Design a protein around this nucleic acid. Structure first.
Lengths: 49, 90, 1368, 50, 85
DNA sequence: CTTGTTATCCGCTCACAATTCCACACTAATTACGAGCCGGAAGCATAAAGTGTAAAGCCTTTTTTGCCTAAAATGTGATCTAGATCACATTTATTGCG
DNA sequence: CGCAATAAATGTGATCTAGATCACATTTTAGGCAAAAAAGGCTTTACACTTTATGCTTCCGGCTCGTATAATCGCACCTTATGTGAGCGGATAACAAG
C-alpha cells in the first residue's frame, strides 16, 4: 500500500458507523488506480444460411 | 412526519378501519376516472414541482362516515359498468 | 373474479372417459426430421390437440381462414397451443390394478371394506403365488389363504370348486359383488358379542368408512383404476435445446414401459406359461403402475442409463423429494433493487435515501406514465428509445414521480416486524442506500459493507397501508413489552450528554454571593444560579453563563444545558423530569409517557431536535489520542499486592508435597478471575470525581469513541470487559479442552505481551466465534410452530355473549411456588364487582379498563381472587373479542378489531430467542448449580417466632430440630411478616420462641457441612445385622480426630455382605416393629454408606436424638434451561426430559425413607381410604415440605410437568395458567419483558378437543369442540332423555397436532401429513370454506382477516360519494 | 443490480434473470409472516400472483 | 408464443388502428380491399370483384391492390398489416 | 399345570430436510459387419386453366409554368402648413385638516 | 378663505424631423387563358405464377434377413467404513386368570 497523513478527529456525524470521508486532493494525483482487464472474443460459425 | 395522518386515527376509535376508508375507495377513484369525486377540490394533497400541483392522493376525504351501507360485491360490479375506462391514441 | 369453496370426490372411468378423446398405444414420441409427432403416439395430436396455432400436424389447414374444423384425414380440430395443458387421455389395462393413494393410506379402502385387515393379507398375495379366496363355496372364511401344496390336492376329491384367483385379479370383482346396505348391519351387531381386541379392534374402522360411501354419492368400485390419465405435454415439453438436439422428460419413459407390461400378459403367458412364472409377471404390473402415480412408497423405480432417483408424478407435484418442509415457497418480485448501504445525516426519522440511477430502473412502468402526460414524451414507445443505453439520459420529472410513494426496506433476516419499515424515498446523488442512524437499532446492522434489498408497492391499497402500520413513525413502542425500541445510538447521545454536564461534588448550602463562581458546576442553591437571574431564556448563554430559569411557574437552579432540551418538551406536552444526568436510559421512560395521553404526532416531533443537536456538539469535542493518553490506574498496584501474597504461598506448599498440582490448578482461578473485575470498577470511580473529560482509546474505527469513560457512562458502547484490555490487565484465558491456564497474563498491551504469554492468549480467542454459531443460524424455529397453527386465532367480534360469572379467576398463588406479578393483570377489563375492604365508594366498576396504576391498587390489599375476562374464557367459535384480551401494547389503547393476536404473539416471543441459549456444554461435569448463606441475621427489630416447630434436647447437647418446615421471620407490631428465611434440617438455634432481638445480631447458626438424621418417633435401638469388620468399620479423622463408625457402601460389600442391608430398627416392649399410622410401613431407619454413628447397641433414644448423619453432596440434573428446546416442550405437549411424577389422590404428607433412596409414591398423600405406593429415581429434587395441603395437578417436584398428567384434575382453567406462566419463567431470568396474553391465545387452541371416556352407545374416537357442555353432558335425563349418560374428559394435545385435526382438509395438507387428508375428504366430500389463513395463500384471494374480516367488511366509505346509495 | 421487467418460463411462469437483464429479488417466506403480523391484505396477495 | 407484459401493450397497438385512418383515403381504391376480406371472407375472385364495384374490368384487380399497398405506408403511428408476415 | 390376553421390546417399513439475495469459474461411457432390398424425393421439364403481375398505349383530369397587358398601385423632391419629441423646472388644482 | 405635501399637470420656444399635399408619367399588380408536365384513369395485349399429373431415373436414405463364430467358464488389485429421531407393525417374554 502507501502512507498518507491524517487529522484524527470526528466529522459532524458523517462518520457514523465505519464511514470515512476522503480528501479530493488524493483523487487528483490518482494514486489509487487499479487495472481490472476483462476478456472478449468473437467466434465465426458455419450456419446453414 | 406526514400531514393529517395522526389526526385520522385519533378522531375515530380504531386504526384498521381507517385503512379501507381510504383504500377500497381511493383505488376505486382511479378506475372510475375522477368524476365520482363530488366534493370540492379543497380537500386535496399538495405536490411541489415546477411551481404547480398534480396527483391527488387521499386521506383528506374521511369526514362523514357511517355504519351499514352496501355489501362488498357491488363495489366493483356497477362501478366498472357505468364507466369502462381504457386507453386510446390518435 | 375470486374463489369460494372447493369440492372433492373420487374419479370414475365414466368421467375420465369424457375429458379423454382416445387411447395411446404407441410408445413412440415424435420425429427428429420434420419435427412432427407420431400418429397415435405419446404426443399425438389426435387426442392432445394441434402442436402449433391453428394448424394440424400434417398440413391440411394452415391459414387462419379455418376458425375450427376437424380434418377428415387427420382427425384433429383447429385450435391454439393453449388447450394443450388441458384435457387428458387413458389406457385400457387388461389386468385390474388397485390404486396406491388408497392402499398405503391407512386405514385401507380397497381391502378394509372387503373384510381384509390392512397388511397381514393384502400385501403378501401381491408377491409370489398366494391364492386367496374371494367368493366362497358354502359358508367359508374371507381371510384364510391357500397354499399351492394344498391347491392341487383340493381339486379332485377332499375339496369342492374353490374360486381360486391370483393377485390383482381378485380385488375389483369383490367391490361390484357386495351390498353396503346388508354388510353394514352385519358388523354393526359385532361390537358387544366378542371382545374388543380380536375383531372389534379392526371393526372400529368399518362402520366409519362405509358410512361415508352411503352418505355421499359414491361407490366402492371406484378405487380400482382400469385406466390411467396422461399428464399434458405442456408439463412434459419436448423442445430442442441447442445444436440440433432435443430435450425430453424422464417421466415419458414411465409410459413406454407400462405398455410392454400389459401387452405381454395377453398373448404369451395367459395361455401358454404353466403357472410358476405367470404369477411373477402379474406382480410386476402392479409394481409398475403404483410407481408412476407415486414413486418412493414401495419399490422405487430406476430408469435405464444413469440411475438417479427416477421422477414420477406425485413426486413432482407436491414435492416429496424434499420431505415437504423445504417446499418451493418463494415468489420472485418483478420489481426490486439492491445496493451498498451508507449513512445520511440529511435524512429524517421518516425518510430514506436511495441511488439516483436505481430510481429510473425501479419505477420504470411509472415514470413513462408521467412523461406522456407532460411534454418530455408523447408516446411510451418513443420514450423507450430515449433512456436506453446512451449519453442521452437527462434528469426531468424524476423528482415529482417519487413524492408520496413509500418503500419497504427489507434487511434479512427478519424476526419481528421492524425489519420491514416504510420511509418516504428521497433522491440523492450516489450509488448507495442511505439509512437513518436512529433506526439502525431496529435493523441491527452496521455500515461496514452489509447489503439490503428494497421493495416498491404498486397497488394504491398497499400504498395506504405503507403509511398506516408499515411506516416507522407509527411503530415507536415495542409490541413485546411496551418500552420505546428506538433510542439514541452513539453520536446522537454523545451531543446530549455533553451539553448536559455539570461537576457535582458540592459542600452544602450558604449565602454565596461573591468569590466562587466556577463555570457551571452542580450545586444546591448558590453560585451564579442566584447572581445571574434572567426572565427570558434567550439571553443567557452567549459568553457561557448560567443562572435562574423560569419553567412550570417555579424557581429552579440549573444551567443552560440542563434546560436546553427540557424546555422544548413543554412546547408540545408539559411534563416533569427528575433532576438527573440525561442519558440513553433516561429518555426511555420519557417517550413512554409522551404517548399515553396523546396520539402519535406530538411524540414523534420530539425525535427531531434530538438528531440535530446530536451531531453538532459532537464535532467540536476535539477528542484525540496520544502516547500518554493510555494512563493506568494506580489502584492496579493495590489489587496485585494482595494477589502476590497468595502466589508467594502456592508454590511453597507445593515443593513440600502436601498440596497436589491439581489442588493449585483450580485455586489460581478463584483469585485472578475476581481481580480483573475490581480493577475496572476502581478506575471508573476516579473518572467521575476531579475529572471526567479524560480522553483515552487508540486510533481505529468501529462504533465506540474517545474518552473511555464518557462513552461508557453515556450508555453508547464499551463494556467493563472490553475497557479492561486498554487500561487494566489481559485477564484469564482458557484451554482448548476446558481447563484454564495456570500462570496468568497480567502483561498489558502497554508494555507488550511476552512471546509465551501471547501463545496462551490465542487459545481463549477461539471461544468467541464458537458459542454464537447457533443463535445466528436460525432462532426463528420457535415462531415456526405457532404461526402454522394460531393462523386462525384472530378477533371475530367486539362482544360475544358471556356474562361475568364463568370465566377465569387469576389467583395470587401461582408460579414455581408463589411468585405473583403485575404482568398477568396488566391490561384487562374486570368482570364481577370485587368487594375490596375499605371505606364506601371504593369498589371497582364492573365495566372499566385496567391501567398500570389501577393494578397497583389491586395487588396491594386484595391478595385474593380477581374476576377478569381472559382469552381462554371466551365464548365464541374460533376467535377472541377485544374485551376478553386487553391492551394493544403496540400503542396505548384497547385492541382494535383486526389485530391478529395469533401471529404477532408468535413473533413477540420468537425474536427474543436470539438472546437465550446459554451454557449447554461441559467444563468438568456439572452435577448441580450454586448456593450460599451459612448464617442468618436480623437487620431490624422485633421478636423471634416459629411456626410448626419441634425442638427438644439432643444427647449431643445441641438444640436440634425434628420438623422440616420451620421458618425464621420477624413479627411486626401488626403481626405481619417483614422478612422470611429458610432453616436447613438438623440446625441448632441459639434462642427459643419468644426471645427479643435487635439490629445486626445473629439468631441462628447451623453446620451446612453435615446433614444429621433424626427419628420422628420413640423406641429402643436395635442394630440390624451390622457386624464390625463385615459391614461397618471405624474410621478416624485426621482433622477433627474424632473416631466414628463408618458404614461401607453396598457395592463395596463382599459376597455375603451384600445380602445384608444395614439399618437401625426400633420396637416396643414385645419386639414388634413400630407401624406408622396411615401409610402403614415399617419404621426401619436405614443408614446408607458414608454414615457415621456414635450410639451403642442397647441404649435409650427419645424423639430428637441423632441416630446418625449423612454428609450431603450435590445432585440433580440442571432444571434451569432456556431457549428453543425448552419452549418446544410444553407447547408440543411432549414429555419433558426432566420427569416429575405426580400423585393421583389427595391427602396428607407422611415422610418415609428407605435404604434404596426414598420410596413411597412421590410424597404419597394419606386420605381416609386406601393409599398407594410406587417408585421413582433419586434424581429428583425436593420442593414441598411436610404439613402441606396439596391436591392433584400441583407440581410436587421442580422443573416442567407432564401436561397430560395434571389434565386429569386441573381441567382447563388451571392447566392453562400453568403452561402460560411456566414459559414466562425462562424469559424472566433473561431480563426481557413480555405479556402473558401472548400465550393465552395460543394455549386456548389446545382446548379445541376433548376425548370421551364413558361410551354407552357411541364409539371412542369422538371428540370435538369443548363449547358444548350444555347438551352433551346434559344428554342423560334432561336434554333428550335417552337414559344414556356419558362423562367426558378434557384433552390438551400439542400445538402442531391441534391444527392437524382441523375440519378443513387443505389445512393439515399444507402442513404435516397431507397424503392422508386428501383421501379422507374425497370419500365423504368435505366442502371446505375459506376461513383459515394459509388456505387462502395457496388459492389466491383477499385475506380472510386482519384488515378484511366478516365483522369489518360490513361498514365501508364508498357510496360513490353520493351516487351509489340508491344502487343496492 | 435492479430489475423491473424480464423473461418468464412456460410451466413455471416466474421472473428470471438473463445476461443483459438483471435479476428479481425472490420474496422469501421469511418476509411473509412479518407482513401477516400487521394484519394487511392486498399487499400480501400481490407478492404471490401478478 | 406468450408475449411478455413489456411488448404486450405494443403488439396490441399494432393491429387495431389502421382501419381508422384507412377511411381517410380515396373511396374507390380503399373500398376495394377493405370491403372484400375485412368485412366478408376470402379475397381475389377476379370475375366476381369486377361486379362488386360495377366499373372497370379484371385489369385493375391487380392495379388497385398494388396502388393501395404503397398507400399502407401512411399509417405510421397506427399499424395492423405489419404483424402477420 | 395350561391357558389366555396384555405389556414391552425389537426390527422394520414408513413418512418425511424452511435463515434471506447475488457474483465468478467449470463439466459425459456403451450392442460385429456386409449384401440386398424398397423407400423417398433430386428437383427434371412438362402443360394446362386458372389466377394475379408487370410492360407502357392513348384518353381525361390536375397542376406549374410562361405568357399578355388592361387596369390599379407606386416614387420623383423641394416647400409648406399641421404634427410630433425630449429633459425634469416650476406651477397648478385635487380632495381634507384644523 | 388659507394651509399641507405627495402626484399629477404646466409652461417655455428655438431645433429638427414627421407627415402631408398635389397632376402626370413609370412601374407593379391582379387573374385571366393555353401549353407543358404530371396524376390516375381505364382500356387492350405481353408474359409468368405456383401448381400438380406424372413417371423415369440415380443417389441417398432407411430396414431387414441369414450366416459364421465361440461358448453353456476363470484371479489379484485398488481404497472406506452417512446422520438421527420419530412413528409403526411384528415377534417375544412376563403376567394373571382358569
Amino acid at each position: 500500500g502507501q502512507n498518507m497523513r491524517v487529522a484524527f478527529m470526528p466529522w459532524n456525524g458523517y462518520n457514523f458507523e465505519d464511514s470515512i470521508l476522503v480528501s479530493e486532493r488524493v483523487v487528483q494525483e490518482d494514486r489509487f488506480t487499479t487495472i481490472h482487464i476483462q476478456e472478449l472474443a468473437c467466434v465465426s460459425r458455419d450456419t446453414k444460411l | 412526519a406526514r400531514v393529517t395522518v395522526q389526526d385520522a386515527v385519533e378522531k375515530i376509535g380504531n386504526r384498521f378501519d381507517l385503512v379501507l376508508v381510504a383504500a377500497r375507495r381511493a383505488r376505486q377513484m382511479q378506475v372510475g376516472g375522477k368524476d365520482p369525486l363530488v366534493p370540492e377540490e379543497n380537500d386535496k394533497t399538495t405536490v411541489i414541482a415546477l411551481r404547480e400541483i398534480e396527483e391527488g392522493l387521499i386521506n383528506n376525504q374521511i369526514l362523514d362516515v357511517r355504519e351499514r351501507q352496501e355489501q362488498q360485491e357491488q363495489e366493483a360490479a356497477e362501478l366498472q359498468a357505468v364507466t369502462a375506462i381504457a386507453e386510446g391514441r390518435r | 373474479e375470486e374463489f369460494d369453496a372447493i369440492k372433492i370426490a373420487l374419479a370414475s372411468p365414466d368421467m375420465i372417459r369424457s375429458w379423454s378423446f382416445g387411447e395411446v398405444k404407441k410408445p413412440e414420441t415424435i420425429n427428429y426430421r420434420t419435427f412432427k409427432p407420431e400418429r397415435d403416439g405419446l404426443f399425438c395430436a389426435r387426442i392432445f390437440g394441434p402442436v402449433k396455432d391453428y394448424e394440424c400436424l400434417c398440413g391440411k389447414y394452415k391459414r387462419l381462414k379455418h376458425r375450427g374444423v376437424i380434418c377428415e384425414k387427420c382427425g384433429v380440430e383447429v385450435t391454439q397451443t393453449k388447450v394443450r395443458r388441458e384435457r387428458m387421455g387413458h389406457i385400457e389395462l387388461a389386468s385390474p390394478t388397485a390404486h396406491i393413494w388408497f392402499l398405503k393410506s391407512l386405514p385401507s379402502r380397497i381391502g378394509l371394506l372387503l373384510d381384509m385387515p390392512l397388511r397381514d393379507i393384502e400385501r403378501v398375495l401381491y408377491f409370489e403365488s398366494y391364492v386367496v379366496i374371494e367368493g366362497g363355496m358354502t359358508n367359508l372364511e374371507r381371510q384364510q389363504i391357500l397354499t399351492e401344496e394344498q391347491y392341487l390336492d383340493a381339486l379332485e376329491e377332499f375339496g369342492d370348486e374353490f374360486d381360486a384367483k391370483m393377485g390383482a385379479e381378485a380385488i375389483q370383482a369383490l367391490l361390484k359383488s357386495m351390498d353396503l346396505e346388508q354388510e353394514c348391519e352385519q358388523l354393526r351387531e359385532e361390537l358387544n358379542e366378542t371382545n374388543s381386541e380380536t375383531k372389534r379392534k379392526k371393526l372400529t374402522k368399518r362402520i366409519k368408512l362405509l358410512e361415508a360411501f352411503v352418505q355421499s354419492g359414491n361407490k366402492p368400485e371406484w378405487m380400482i383404476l382400469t385406466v390411467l390419465p396422461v399428464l399434458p405435454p405442456d408439463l412434459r415439453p419436448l423442445v430442442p435445446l441447442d445444436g440440433g438436439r432435443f430435450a425430453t422428460s424422464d417421466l415419458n419413459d414411465l409410459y413406454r414401459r407400462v405398455i410392454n407390461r400389459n401387452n405381454r400378459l395377453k398373448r404369451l403367458l395367459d395361455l401358454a406359461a404353466p403357472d410358476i412364472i405367470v404369477r411373477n409377471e402379474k406382480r410386476m404390473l402392479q409394481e409398475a403402475v403404483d410407481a408412476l402415480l407415486d414413486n418412493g412408497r414401495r419399490g422405487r423405480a430406476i430408469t435405464g442409463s444413469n440411475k438417479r432417483p427416477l421422477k414420477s408424478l406425485a413426486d413432482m407435484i407436491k414435492g416429496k423429494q424434499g420431505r415437504f418442509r423445504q417446499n418451493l415457497l418463494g415468489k420472485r418480485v418483478d420489481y426490486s433493487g439492491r445496493s451498498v448501504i451508507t449513512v445520511g445525516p440529511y435524512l429524517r426519522l421518516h425518510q430514506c435515501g436511495l441511488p439516483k440511477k436505481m430510481a429510473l430502473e425501479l419505477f420504470k412502468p411509472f415514470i413513462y406514465g408521467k412523461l406522456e402526460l407532460r411534454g418530455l414524451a408523447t408516446t411510451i414507445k418513443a420514450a423507450k428509445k430515449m433512456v436506453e443505453r446512451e449519453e442521452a439520459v437527462v434528469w426531468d420529472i424524476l423528482d415529482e414521480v417519487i413524492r408520496e410513494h413509500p418503500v419497504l426496506l427489507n434487511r434479512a433476516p427478519t424476526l419481528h416486524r421492524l425489519g420491514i419499515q416504510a420511509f418516504e424515498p428521497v433522491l440523492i446523488e450516489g450509488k448507495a442506500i442511505q439509512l437513518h442512524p436512529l433506526v439502525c437499532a431496529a435493523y441491527n446492522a452496521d455500515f461496514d459493507g452489509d447489503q439490503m434489498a428494497v421493495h416498491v408497492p404498486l397497488t394504491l391499497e398497499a400504498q395506504l397501508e405503507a403509511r398506516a402500520l408499515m411506516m416507522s413513525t407509527n411503530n415507536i413502542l415495542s409490541p413485546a413489552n411496551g418500552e420505546p425500541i428506538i433510542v439514541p445510538s452513539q453520536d446522537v447521545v454523545l451531543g446530549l450528554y455533553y451539553m448536559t454536564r455539570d461537576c457535582v461534588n458540592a459542600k452544602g448550602e450558604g449565602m454565596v454571593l461573591t468569590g466562587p463562581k466556577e463555570a457551571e458546576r452542580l450545586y444546591r442553591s448558590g453560585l451564579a444560579s442566584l447572581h445571574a437571574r434572567v426572565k427570558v431564556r434567550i439571553t443567557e448563554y452567549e459568553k457561557d453563563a448560567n443562572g435562574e430559569l423560569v419553567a412550570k411557574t417555579s424557581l429552579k437552579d440549573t444551567t443552560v444545558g440542563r434546560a436546553i432540551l427540557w424546555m422544548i418538551v413543554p412546547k408540545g406536552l408539559p411534563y416533569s423530569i427528575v433532576n438527573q444526568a440525561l442519558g440513553k436510559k433516561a429518555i426511555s421512560k420519557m417517550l413512554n409517557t409522551c404517548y399515553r395521553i396523546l396520539g402519535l404526532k406530538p411524540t414523534v416531533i420530539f425525535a427531531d431536535q434530538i438528531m440535530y443537536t446530536g451531531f453538532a456538539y459532537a464535532a467540536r469535542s476535539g477528542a484525540s489520542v496520544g502516547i500518554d493518553d493510555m494512563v493506568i490506574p494506580e489502584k492496579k498496584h493495590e489489587i496485585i499486592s494482595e494477589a502476590e501474597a497468595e502466589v508467594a504461598e502456592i508454590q511453597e506448599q507445593f515443593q513440600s508435597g502436601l498440596v497436589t498440582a491439581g489442588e493449585r490448578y483450580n485455586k489460581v482461578i478463584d483469585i485472578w478471575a475476581a481481580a480483573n473485575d475490581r480493577v475496572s470498577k476502581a478506575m471508573m470511580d476516579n473518572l467521575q470525581t476531579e475529572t471526567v473529560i479524560n480522553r483515552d482509546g487508540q486510533e481505529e474505527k468501529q462504533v465506540s469513541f474517545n474518552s473511555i469513560y464518557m462513552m461508557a457512562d453515556s450508555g453508547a458502547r464499551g463494556s467493563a470487559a472490553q475497557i479492561r484490555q486498554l487500561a487494566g490487565m489481559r485477564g484469564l484465558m482458557a484451554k482448548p479442552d476446558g481447563s484454564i491456564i495456570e500462570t496468568p497474563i497480567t502483561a498489558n498491551f502497554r508494555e507488550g505481551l511476552n512471546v509465551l504469554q501471547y501463545f496462551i492468549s490465542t487459545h481463549g480467542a477461539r471461544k468467541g466465534l464458537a458459542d454464537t454459531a447457533l443463535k445466528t443460524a436460525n432462532s426463528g424455529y420457535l415462531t415456526r410452530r405457532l404461526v402454522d397453527v394460531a393462523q386462525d386465532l384472530v378477533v371475530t367480534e367486539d362482544d360475544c355473549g358471556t356474562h361475568e360469572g364463568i370465566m377465569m379467576t387469576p389467583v395470587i398463588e401461582g408460579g414455581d411456588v408463589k411468585e405473583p406479578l403485575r404482568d398477568r393483570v396488566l391490561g384487562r377489563v374486570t368482570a364481577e364487582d370485587v368487594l375490596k375492604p375499605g371505606t364506601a365508594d371504593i369498589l371497582v366498576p364492573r365495566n372499566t379498563l385496567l391501567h398500570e396504576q389501577w393494578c397497583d391498587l389491586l395487588e396491594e390489599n386484595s391478595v385474593d381472587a380477581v374476576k377478569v375476562r381472559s382469552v381462554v374464557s371466551c365464548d365464541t367459535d374460533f376467535g377472541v373479542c377485544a374485551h376478553c384480551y386487553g391492551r394493544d401494547l403496540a400503542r396505548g389503547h384497547i385492541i382494535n378489531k383486526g389485530e391478529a393476536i395469533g401471529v404477532i404473539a408468535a413473533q413477540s416471543i420468537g425474536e427474543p430467542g436470539t438472546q437465550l441459549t446459554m451454557r449447554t456444554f461441559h467444563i468438568g461435569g456439572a452435577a448441580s448449580r450454586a448456593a450460599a448463606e451459612s448464617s442468618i441475621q436480623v437487620k431490624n427489630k422485633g421478636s423471634i417466632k416459629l411456626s410448626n416447630v419441634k425442638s427438644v434436647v439432643n444427647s449431643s447437647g445441641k438444640l436440634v430440630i425434628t420438623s422440616r418446615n420451620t421458618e425464621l421471620k420477624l413479627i411486626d407490631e401488626f403481626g405481619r411478616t417483614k422478612e422470611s428465611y429458610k432453616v436447613p434440617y438438623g440446625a441448632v438455634l441459639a434462642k427459643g420462641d419468644g426471645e427479643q432481638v435487635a439490629g445486626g445480631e445473629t439468631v441462628a447458626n447451623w453446620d451446612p457441612h453435615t446433614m444429621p438424621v433424626i427419628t420422628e418417633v420413640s423406641g429402643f435401638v436395635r442394630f440390624t445385622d451390622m457386624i464390625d469388620g463385615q459391614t461397618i468399620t471405624r474410621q478416624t479423622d485426621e482433622l477433627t480426630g474424632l473416631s466414628s463408625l463408618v458404614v461401607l457402601d453396598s457395592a463395596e460389600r463382599t459376597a455375603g455382605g451384600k445380602d445384608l442391608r444395614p439399618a437401625l430398627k426400633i420396637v416396643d416392649a414385645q419386639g414388634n416393629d413400630v407401624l406408622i399410622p396411615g401409610t402403614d410401613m415399617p419404621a426401619q431407619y436405614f443408614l446408607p454408606g458414608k454414615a457415621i454413628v456414635q450410639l451403642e447397641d442397647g441404649v435409650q433414644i427419645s424423639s430428637g436424638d441423632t441416630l446418625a448423619r449423612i454428609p450431603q453432596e450435590s445432585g440433580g440434573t440442571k432444571d434451569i434451561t432456556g431457549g428453543l428446546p425448552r419452549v418446544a416442550d410444553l407447547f408440543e405437549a411432549r414429555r419433558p426430559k426432566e420427569p416429575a411424577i405426580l400423585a393421583e389422590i389427595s391427602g396428607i404428607v407422611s415422610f418415609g425413607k428407605e435404604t434404596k433412596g426414598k420410596r413411597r409414591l412421590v410424597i404419597t398423600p394419606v386420605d381416609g381410604s386406601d393409599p398407594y405406593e410406587e417408585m421413582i429415581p433419586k434424581w429428583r429434587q425436593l420442593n414441598v415440605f411436610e404439613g402441606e395441603r396439596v391436591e392433584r395437578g400441583d407440581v410436587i417436584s421442580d422443573g416442567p410437568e407432564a401436561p397430560h398428567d395434571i389434565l386429569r384434575l386441573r381441567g382447563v382453567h388451571a392447566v392453562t395458567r400453568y403452561i402460560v406462566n411456566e414459559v414466562q419463567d425462562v424469559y424472566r431470568l433473561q431480563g426481557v419483558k413480555i405479556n402473558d396474553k401472548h400465550i393465552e391465545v395460543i394455549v386456548r387452541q389446545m382446548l379445541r378437543k376433548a376425548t370421551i371416556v364413558n361410551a354407552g352407545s357411541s364409539d371412542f374416537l369422538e371428540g370435538e369442540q369443548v363449547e358444548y357442555s350444555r347438551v352433551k353432558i346434559a344428554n342423560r335425563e334432561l336434554e333428550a332423555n335417552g337414559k344414556v349418560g356419558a362423562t367426558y374428559s378434557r384433552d390438551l394435545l400439542g400445538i402442531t397436532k391441534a391444527s392437524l385435526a382441523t375440519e378443513s382438509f387443505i389445512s393439515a395438507a399444507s402442513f404435516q401429513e397431507t397424503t392422508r387428508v386428501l383421501t379422507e375428504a374425497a370419500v365423504a366430500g368435505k366442502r371446505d370454506e375459506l376461513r383459515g389463513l394459509k388456505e387462502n395463500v395457496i388459492v389466491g384471494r383477499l385475506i380472510p382477516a386482519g384488515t378484511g374480516y366478516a365483522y369489518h367488511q360490513d361498514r365501508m366509505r364508498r357510496r360513490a360519494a353520493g351516487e351509489a346509495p340508491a344502487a343496492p | 443490480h435492479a430489475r423491473s421487467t424480464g423473461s418468464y418460463s412456460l410451466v413455471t411462469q416466474q421472473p428470471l434473470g438473463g445476461k443483459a437483464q438483471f435479476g428479481g429479488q425472490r420474496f422469501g417466506e421469511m418476509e411473509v409472516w412479518a407482513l401477516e403480523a400487521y394484519g394487511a391484505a392486498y399487499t400480501l396477495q400481490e407478492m404471490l400472483t401478478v | 408464443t406468450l408475449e411478455l407484459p413489456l411488448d404486450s401493450a405494443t403488439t396490441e397497438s399494432l393491429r387495431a388502428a389502421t382501419h381508422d385512418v384507412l377511411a381517410g383515403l380515396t373511396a374507390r381504391e380503399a373500398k376495394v380491399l377493405r370491403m372484400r376480406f375485412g368485412i366478408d371472407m376470402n379475397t381475389d375472385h377476379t370475375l366476381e370483384e369486377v361486379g362488386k364495384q360495377f366499373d372497370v374490368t379484371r385489369e385493375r384487380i391487380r392495379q388497385i391492390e398494388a396502388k393501395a399497398l404503397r398507400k399502407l405506408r401512411h399509417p405510421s403511428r397506427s399499424e395492423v398489416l405489419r404483424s402477420f408476415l
